[PDB]
Amino acid sequence: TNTLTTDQLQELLQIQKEFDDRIPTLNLGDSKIAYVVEFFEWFNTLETFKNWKKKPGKPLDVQLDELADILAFGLSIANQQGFEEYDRDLFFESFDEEYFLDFPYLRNQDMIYDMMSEFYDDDLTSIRRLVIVFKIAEQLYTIDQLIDAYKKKMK
Amino acid sequence: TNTLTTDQLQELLQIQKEFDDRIPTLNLGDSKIAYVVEFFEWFNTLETFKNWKKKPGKPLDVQLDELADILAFGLSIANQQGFEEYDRDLFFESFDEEYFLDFPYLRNQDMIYDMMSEFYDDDLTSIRRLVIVFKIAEQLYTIDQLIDAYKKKMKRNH
């Protein structure tokens, strides 16, 4: 129904934790950088700046597979910083409140400047990274489509 | 074979011009976004943040082909704004002056944050965009390898 429950979120955090447990070299600095790199890879699949293309936008399954990479690093960063009940409650409060990240904006190629703006601020929260990826799923795709692409990626 | 001459630069601007002349929808705003997206595509090929891979890094030819995309949009942005002898001289002056962009710096995955801080600056210049890509070529690769990858790219694009 295009909603995210705390149960779903905790399940996703558990799947990432099990994946990341197999990486003894895991570190927050690298994971935060990968999130930004994967964001740009996803943004590139939208092709909203590619005026030279007749039919802009990669296939939906390709856009979703790239969105799922962002989700993976967002979940990982949240696990690595610690993501407990306190953090979930903040996430859902922010997520329900958030109205800036809607369909037309995300379609506007200029949004990438607002994202970079957030990404080089060292104080960006694990909450914010997850709000962004789920809002993109909720407004441009569905949450279920993203969760499906993520689970496929992880198995 | 790791130097850039004004003859070489004028030649690259002319190649980009001939390509872009064939794109009736060309616009500067989209080209400035494309430069940044392609910068990140190239940075992803280094894999310097991928501690979970044993031997990180895409093939050298893949790295150079992505570096050449950055060069293409930097040349395009320069051409679209107007880039005359006056600007070429300022470019070479900057390029020669540039000493922050060295092998150790580019090596460091944290460098992307410094790049982002330039990319989100509305006042980022066309000269600076070209200094960045040619310095990356000079320091991590060679300028000649970048030019060669770019010229091939532009022949496959027509």
Author numbering:
A (entry chain A): 2 to 156
B (entry chain D): 2 to 159
What does the literature reporting this entry say, word for word?
SaPIs are clinically relevant pathogenicity islands, residing passively in the host chromosome under control of the SaPI master repressor, Stl. Some Staphylococcus aureus phages encode dimeric instead of trimeric Duts, which are completely unrelated at both sequence and structural levels. The crystal structure of the ϕDI Dut described here represents the first structural characterization of this group of dimeric Duts, revealing particular features. Remarkably for unrelated proteins, our results indicate the de-repression mechanism used by dimeric and trimeric Duts is conceptually identical, involving dUTP as a second messenger turning off Stl-Dut interaction.
To validate this idea, we obtained the three-dimensional structure of ϕDI Dut in apo form, allowing us to compare this with the dUPNPP bound structure. The apo ϕDI structure showed a dimeric organization that, surprisingly, presents a “closed” conformation almost identical to the dUPNPP-bound form. This was confirmed by the minimal differences observed when both dimers were superimposed (RMSD of 0.36 Å). The major differences are observed at the C-terminal helix α8, where electron density is poorly defined for the apo structure’s last fourteen residues, indicating that the region is highly flexible. Similarly, the last five residues of helix α8 of the dUPNPP-bound structure present poor density, confirming the high intrinsic mobility of this region. These minimal changes could represent the transition between “open” and “closed” conformations in phagic dimeric Duts. Although to a lesser extent, the nucleotide seems to stabilize the C-terminal helix of the phagic dimeric Duts, similarly to the dUTP-induced ordering of C-terminal motif V in the trimeric Duts. Oppositely, the binding of the nucleotide seems to have minimal conformational effect in the ϕDI Dut, which presents a “closed” conformation in its apo state. Therefore, the absence of the major part of the mobile C-terminal portion, which also provides several phosphate interacting residues, would explain the fixed closed conformation observed for the ϕDI Dut.
